[PDB]
């Protein structure tokens, strides 16, 4: 996308054209084989707006003068967006059974916290020091 997801603030997302937003939505949909095609545009837009807001408020600033967003800000925001869409879908699937066909996934026991609860959030955590408190300051 021309305006990249990391170049866009919450205010900027609201100002983008429908096509500029749709390009970012299209990129987020590349992170799932299903594309979350049965979830409507508004829900995907809400997830991306929420991920942008959450990057800028919870994953901004510094620890010991290191940036708290250590990884690529583009892919962090995309993984955070994908995490949100998957939570809007009801969570991460452990088992799916249909017309005889069944699959179980190795997703269990990931931990209790928000980002630990889906595969996209586990990927987002690596960009952000795994939520560790590396901050330090001095008196002068």
């Amino acid at each position: 996308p021309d305006p990249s997801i990391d170049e866009v603030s919450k205010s900027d997302w609201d100002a983008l054209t429908t096509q500029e937003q749709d390009d970012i939505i299209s990129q987020v949909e590349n992170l799932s084989s299903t594309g979350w095609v049965n979830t409507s545009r508004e829900r995907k837009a809400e997830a991306i707006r929420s991920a942008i807001a959450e990057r800028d408020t919870l994953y901004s600033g510094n620890m010991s003068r290191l940036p708290t967003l250590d990884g690529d800000a583009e892919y962090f925001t995309l993984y955070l967006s994908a995490h949100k869409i998957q939570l809007f879908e009801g969570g991460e699937a452990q088992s799916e059974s249909g017309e005889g066909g069944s699959v179980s996934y190795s997703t269990g026991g990931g931990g209790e916290k928000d980002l630990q609860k889906t595969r996209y959030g586990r990927m987002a955590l690596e960009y952000v020091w795994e939520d560790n408190s590396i901050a330090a300051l001095r008196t002068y």
Binding site: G61, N62, M63, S64, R65, T68, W129, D131, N132, S133, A135, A136, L137, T139
Partner: protein, 113 residues
């Protein structure tokens, strides 16, 4: 060795305050957050009988004064220097056991004379 002792006294001769913020495996605390905590616990504005009220997730730890025998290092330095320059150890404001009295003292002062 004198320079080393002086620098070591500044780092290690005095306790230092270590304020740890947040829960272990809890929410991360960032630099701007620690600036506000620094303002509350500043040793510049603290007085001898300041009291602290906190939640459970603030810890006031101490870097202790770490023991080293700088006096013994000074005595060894002064012994090395005085014995090298030929003066008795007493000239360096350093005393030594058993040497201060009797025929031990007589010999060292005789050597000086």
């Amino acid at each position: 060795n004198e320079a080393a002792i002086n620098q070591a006294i500044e780092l290690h001769g005095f306790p230092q305050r270590h304020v740890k913020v947040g829960k272990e495996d809890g929410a991360p605390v960032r630099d701007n957050d620690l600036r506000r905590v620094r303002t509350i616990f500043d040793p510049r504005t603290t007085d001898a009988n300041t009291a602290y009220f906190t939640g459970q997730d603030v810890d006031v730890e101490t870097l202790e004064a770490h023991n080293f025998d700088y006096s013994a290092i000074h005595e060894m330095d002064m012994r090395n220097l005085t014995t090298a320059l030929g003066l008795p150890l007493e000239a360096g404001n350093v005393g030594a056991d058993g040497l201060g009295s009797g025929k031990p003292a007589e010999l060292r002062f005789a050597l000086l004379k």
